[PDB]
Nucleic acid binder design. Structure first.
Lengths: 144, 147
RNA sequence: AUUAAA
RNA sequence: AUUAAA
């Protein structure tokens, strides 16, 4: 069986990071019941268009309060991921070099991941409300 | 991702071929490469395939209750919810002998017949509007599936 | 338990 | 011009 993979995991050179991630990744709607669906949407952060604006700070605010309040008022969970999301950039490269699925996202572009867990008709409406409020953060020029 | 792929090809070339599963998995990860923007705020496409309960209600035909006379009640729902709803899956066609239609010819046009009988709600709008339209459509479509 | 739209 | 949440 595939447990051959376990023999590869221990014996593979740690210098191959993406292969060791893929091998460890390989370890393996009804509306009338109306149980809780989960959704997610990855929203790009326009650093190409606004390179002089720091979005990560405007989004989080003091001790993350502004992101917490948006999460609370939209009833969603938001996570800032991608290249440039971490505060320590030397740690961000070594964690990207670490190439663990948890930190794998750093290879991608700076973006927000909004998650919502609710019954389906509510879960879609909550995500739509969150997408309307988050653009005020991602659009400095929202006047006109 | 301009940084990710050159490291895969570097691993591909430098890796020991004796690792067959690991080398196969990085090749599968390479074949993949051969996400919303709200400041440009262009239209996305959302869809949700909503099964309708024939296992729970085998005696109730929903597809007729959904369409109505000449599809008036379904188009009225598509108008008020501003979505495109298409009934697909096994039993969607009224003629079930002409169903299992081709399907060994294998056209993705007809591939949906292998899926269970459902309703695919598609909505085309900007992301904030698209997600809010879908949520409203799922609100109203319950009323057809709860006799 | 006759609803058939795109 | 600062903000650093999970």
């Amino acid at each position: 069986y595939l447990p051959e993979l376990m023999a590869e995991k221990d014996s593979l050179d740690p210098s191959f990071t993406h292969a060791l991630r893929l091998v460890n990744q390989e370890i393996e709607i009804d509306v009338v019941i109306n149980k809780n669906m989960k959704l997610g949407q990855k929203v790009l952060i326009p650093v190409k268009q606004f390179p002089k604006f720091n979005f990560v700070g405007k989004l989080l605010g003091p001790r993350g309060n502004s992101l917490k309040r948006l999460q609370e008022e939209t009833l969603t969970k938001m996570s800032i991921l991608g290249k440039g999301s971490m505060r320590d950039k030397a740690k961000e490269e070594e964690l990207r070099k670490s190439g663990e699925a948890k930190y794998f996202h750093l290879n991608d572009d700076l973006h927000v991941l909004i998650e919502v867990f609710a019954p389906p008709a509510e879960a879609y409406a909550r995500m739509g409300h969150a997408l309307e409020e988050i653009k005020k953060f991602l659009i400095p020029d929202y006047n006109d």
